[PDB]
Design a protein around this ligand. Structure first.
Ligand SMILES: Cc1cc2nc3c(=O)[nH]c(=O)nc-3n(C[C@H](O)[C@H](O)[C@H](O)COP(=O)(O)OP(=O)(O)OC[C@H]3O[C@@H](n4cnc5c(N)ncnc54)[C@H](O)[C@@H]3O)c2cc1C
Ligand SMILES: Cc1cc2nc3c(=O)[nH]c(=O)nc-3n(C[C@H](O)[C@H](O)[C@H](O)COP(=O)(O)OP(=O)(O)OC[C@H]3O[C@@H](n4cnc5c(N)ncnc54)[C@H](O)[C@@H]3O)c2cc1C
Ligand SMILES: CC(C)(COP(=O)(O)OP(=O)(O)OC[C@H]1O[C@@H](n2cnc3c(N)ncnc32)[C@H](O)[C@@H]1OP(=O)(O)O)[C@@H](O)C(=O)NCCC(=O)NCCS
Ligand SMILES: CC(C)(COP(=O)(O)OP(=O)(O)OC[C@H]1O[C@@H](n2cnc3c(N)ncnc32)[C@H](O)[C@@H]1OP(=O)(O)O)[C@@H](O)C(=O)NCCC(=O)NCCS
Ligand SMILES: Nc1ncnc2c1ncn2[C@@H]1O[C@H](COP(=O)(O)OP(=O)(O)O)[C@@H](O)[C@H]1O
Lengths: 553, 557
């Protein structure tokens, strides 16, 4: 029989506590949470504010009474752990209502304190009456009550990451005008620039004003005026701050436990801190990314849930399966669009100086001859020699979550781009095609790995054309509606073989089509004829989405 | 070195044939590639045919993915539609082709021959079938045009579908779509042979709710009154206006037989690891060939479009000496839309594993398609079959109204990557409220299976419980008292999970304890608690929900 004390009672904390009970009836399990609720769905909060989740009670999954009863758990809400006394193996707990303190001994201590919102040093941030960050239920009730009473016409969201975007969507749907202010040149950092171009274009069609490479310089007239670094002024009725989170590691810091990147709690493969009787899981810990084993911080719910269930097994379960890192699989709903990412993106790979190739493949969510088929764009990032997958990103209106999950599975199973075409996924017209989008991205990546095709990227083509590259557009004339890449010469794929005598043999040939497929087929033709040829990855559609001001008519 | 150009002849211009031809052209401009197809159309979507009949697909031209003119131009292919290969002269290295239009026959020399002739519908020798006027099978566009013309001109009010396979079911759904009353006649005691009995029970419910009459363990004995009366083996009669036969397929291997090529199981064409038949110059792919199942490496026939397409694409590389990647065998992943319900399966089912004397365990877990607090969350049921020692996954079955395709693809991907059930909980899938839960249903079935592999819980199946109760087992129902109005298993004693720890005194130490709840989850937690207190306890896998769906006649109210 052990005494196990768990600090934090949401994702990581509730997960470990429940499994621990299932593993042993004998242990005394104490769960200490500083807020009023345990196991609340914090990820549902934006949807509650948006009125998508109409019932507040639904956000409260399990009650303290029911859970403490079901798992014979000593659950202490509104109790803030203020100090860890690691030589004494006790913690000091403070009552939130009375401020009175008391000590509680432990045999084993588990920290799952989560992460807290980052607040920047903006002049006037303390005079701001209508400034909200979103982390818990009370914060949510505050925003909800604010919107009820003051009926804001316009909201400004500061920070264009996952939280910020969901907040934008949910305020928009309530009928509130929205401006998103972002320091970077794009929304959602985990995804790459060209992918974010689709997202920006979609958010604009829903009347969100996007302000890039700008920040708040000051908050005037009580926060109602936002002065931007660019000189622009935003009149607004509320301000949502969503600029990142930092580990809640002050407890570990106070106890002299070793820290890591961004002040995360440093843990070993079994979630043990630098102290043998103290463990840590959740957003607060340093994780190694699965792909490169670089130490990082990845604050997502799936990992916090898995780490808690695993730690329960480490303490009281059978064989130790060790944590082999986080892939970082995430998904977001952006109005009608689903956006998903896994593994590393080009920006990180470039920062680490790792060589990579990428392929952009757009295919339908299901058989095109079946009603309501919609595009799915997949970007695969891989090693050109081994075919190792570094990461992937996907977006579209449907069947995005399906394809991300398949590829995420592939990466954790250590499959290469060469294995992707062999994944036998379910085919019926309503759900997929004879070759699924995932198989198709596998084929496109394999052709590059095997040397059947050479490609160039959207950010290269204009420069290549300026420097004497011969650019052939192989789209049918009817496809030329939305424009072309400057320098383009149209020779439709079906005429090309008869019109060979028109392609110069002393020049580098670049081919583009709408999505890249026919450009690939034209490339293969000309390669087998002796030409030096490269296909433009993603075709005109990607190019024109990312660089719309460069389109020629 | 490099590549010497050759003449490649492809027999069949749909799934297998089209995919091989296209890739072969991408690999070499110099090769002469001839595609011979007996129908009018190449690369049509026969998987779409039922939907065209149901009017879900409204443009016939939409079933024609590629036209002869377009494709032959794009790939510089000599495509000969309405041309039937009637004989292979393997020593002469020629084939005889009959142009069906002009009646002219000629011989075509080949260096390489690729056979992708497919599977034909089994037509049974039922008396009266010859005189049956409104009897149809479905394979190609002309069959579809005939059935559709019949519906429009003759206005049937009732249809009988003989055969409850995946294709029979699709016909049923699409006939209901047009406003036709439908009776489905199956010989087995369940629709869709790939799925197990208790999973089929859910499918039957959904079809009966859409007003389909299901007739099981009955076959058509005769077709009387010119096909307007179907007389069943039991003796019952079905008056109908039209009959659709969907009783399975058999390989189109007459050409192989005639050429003296080796045949594999069920008359399929036998091929080696490289799709080579018993003649070095003749290759074969598609529904017509014998493939190994991925899971057991048993020779079998699996007529699905994905394998055909994959095989065709692989063969093209093999022909060009790229033999690194050879065919690993088919997992047999299939998905079906049944009215509002999606049904998916992969690998081997219980019926097959018994047939092979393979020890297995199963788990049945029902979970939500996505976060429960997020609107329109619907239950998803996954049955997972595995080895209790290794954790090797033998197969999976899934059903639900949404989020079914996704889970099967993940599990199918896990199986092909050689992951055990112990790895399923470690699959980091995307979590956002509209798409999943913090632990996806796949993670969940993985945990359930891992608990069985690790010995944390012992379970009994829906088909074992009643006999165990008859033999003295003590069955405790851990649901709340209110939940019992939905019915219960004979012999059950009610002790609510929450109260159970408080009422341990009422649990006998001299009996084998069996636990049931609604879905199995609460039963498992109760099982865990009692084992820890030193009781010998087992959980009823799937709980009462499963039991009552599969054996409703046994429910005590
Ligand atoms: C609005 C919002 C939406 C999100 N949406 C998603 C999503 O869609 N998908 C996804 O994967 N992730 C999402 N996340 C992130 C996800 O919620 C976290 O990664 C996950 O909750 C981390 O779990 P945790 O146990 O580490 O921390 P938390 O779940 O934050 O739990 C930490 C708990 O410990 C308590 N605590 C901290 N210090 C003390 C102390 N000293 N004493 C007592 N208690 C203490 C806190 O009160 C808190 O309740 C979202 C987060 C937010 C804020
Ligand atoms: C109604 C229907 C629905 C289906 N739905 C699905 C589904 O949802 N999912 C799924 O995976 N599978 C489905 N299938 C099966 C799928 O269509 C087949 O597995 C696939 O087409 C088989 O590929 P194949 O190339 O072997 O044969 P086929 O596509 O049948 O092609 C064989 C071609 O060869 C021609 N041919 C044969 N002999 C000769 C000859 N001697 N000379 C010249 N030509 C010849 C035939 O006319 C035929 O066109 C369905 C089938 C049908 C009929
Ligand atoms: C729900 C919560 C309170 C408790 O978790 P839990 O008790 O593990 O409950 P779960 O449903 O996750 O696990 C179900 C258990 O039953 C098992 N199970 C489920 N269905 C089963 C079935 N049909 N048959 C047999 N076993 C089953 C699972 O294997 C698991 O047991 P194990 O972990 O001992 O193997 C906790 O996860 C929580 O706090 N959740 C919300 C936090 C969160 O995710 N937040 C992010 C914001 S949305
Ligand atoms: C369509 C059909 C002719 C296939 O021909 P195909 O030329 O292989 O056509 P696909 O669209 O599959 O093209 C995929 C090719 O383009 C490549 N590709 C696709 N998208 C690409 C992109 N964005 N960039 C670069 N290449 C791309 C793939 O890598 C692949 O080439 P590869 O095979 O040389 O690697 C054939 O599968 C068919 O007729 N299908 C319908 C018949 C059928 O399946 N019937 C059964 C019932 S549905
Ligand atoms: N001063 C600032 N003004 C505007 N945006 C900012 C500022 N500082 C950071 N950001 C942006 O806010 C976003 C933070 O999002 P992220 O790191 O995903 O955290 P979260 O998911 O909690 O929003 C990033 O896109 C980042 O570039």
């Amino acid at each position: 029989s052990r005494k196990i004390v768990v600090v934090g009672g949401v994702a990581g904390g509730a997960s470990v506590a429940a499994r621990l009970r299932r593993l042993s009836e004998e242990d005394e399990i104490i769960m200490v949470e500083r807020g009023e609720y345990i196991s609340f769905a914090n990820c549902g909060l934006p949807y509650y504010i948006g009125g998508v989740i109409t019932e507040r009670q639904k956000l409260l999954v399990q009650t303290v009474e029911r859970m403490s009863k079901r798992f014979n758990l000593d659950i202490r809400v509104l109790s803030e752990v203020v100090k860890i006394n690691k030589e004494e193996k006790t913690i000091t707990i403070k009552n939130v209502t009375t401020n009175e303190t008391y000590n509680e001994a432990y045999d084993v201590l588990i920290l799952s304190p989560g992460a807290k919102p980052i607040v920047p040093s903006i002049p006037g941030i303390e005079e701001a009456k209508a400034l909200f960050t979103l982390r818990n239920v009370p914060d949510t009730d505050r925003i909800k009550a604010y919107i009820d009473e003051k009926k804001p016409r316009h909201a400004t969201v500061i920070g264009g990451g996952f939280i910020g975007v969901e907040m934008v969507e949910n305020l928009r749907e309530r009928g509130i005008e929205v401006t998103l202010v972002e320091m970077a040149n794009q929304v959602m950092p985990p995804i790459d620039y060209e992918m974010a171009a689709y997202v920006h274009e979609h958010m604009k069609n829903h009347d969100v004003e996007l302000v890039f490479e700008d920040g708040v310089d000051a908050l005037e007239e009580n926060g109602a005026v936002v002065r931007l670094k660019s000189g622009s002024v935003i009149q607004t009725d509320m301000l949502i701050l969503a600029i990142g989170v930092q580990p809640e590691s002050s407890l570990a810091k106070g106890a002299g436990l070793a820290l890591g990147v961004r002040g995360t709690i440093k843990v070993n493969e079994k979630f043990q801190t630098s102290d043998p009787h103290i463990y840590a899981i959740g957003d607060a810990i340093e994780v190694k990314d699965f792909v490169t084993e670089t130490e990082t911080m990845i604050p997502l719910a799936w990992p916090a849930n898995r780490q808690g269930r695993m730690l329960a097994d480490i303490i009281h379960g059978h064989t130790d399966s060790l944590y082999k890192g986080t892939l970082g699989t995430s998904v977001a709903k952006v109005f009608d669009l689903t956006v998903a990412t896994t593994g590393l993106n080009e920006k990180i790979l470039k920062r680490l100086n790792i060589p990579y190739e990428v392929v952009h493949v757009q295919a339908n969510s299901h058989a095109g001859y079946y009603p309501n088929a919609t595009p799915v764009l997949i970007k695969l990032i891989f090693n050109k020699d081994s075919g190792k997958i570094y990461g992937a990103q996907t977006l579209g209106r449907d069947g995005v979550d399906k394809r991300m999950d398949v590829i995420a599975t592939a990466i954790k199973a250590n499959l290469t781009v060469l294995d992707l075409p062999d994944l036998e996924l379910s085919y019926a017209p309503p759900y997929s095609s004879a070759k699924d989008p995932v198989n198709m991205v596998g084929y496109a990546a394999s052709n590059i790995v095997d040397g059947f095709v050479d490609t160039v990227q959207w950010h290269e083509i204009d420069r290549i054309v300026e420097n004497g590259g011969y650019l052939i557009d192989v789209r049918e004339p009817n496809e030329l509606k939305q424009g072309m890449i400057k320098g383009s010469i149209n020779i439709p794929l079906d005429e090309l073989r008869d019109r060979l005598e028109e392609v110069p043999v002393d020049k580098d040939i670049y081919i583009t089509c709408q999505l890249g497929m026919r450009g690939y087929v034209a490339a293969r033709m000309l390669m087998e004829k002796g030409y030096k040829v490269k296909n433009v990855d993603g075709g005109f559609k990607l190019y024109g989405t990312v660089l719309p001001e460069r389109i020629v008519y």
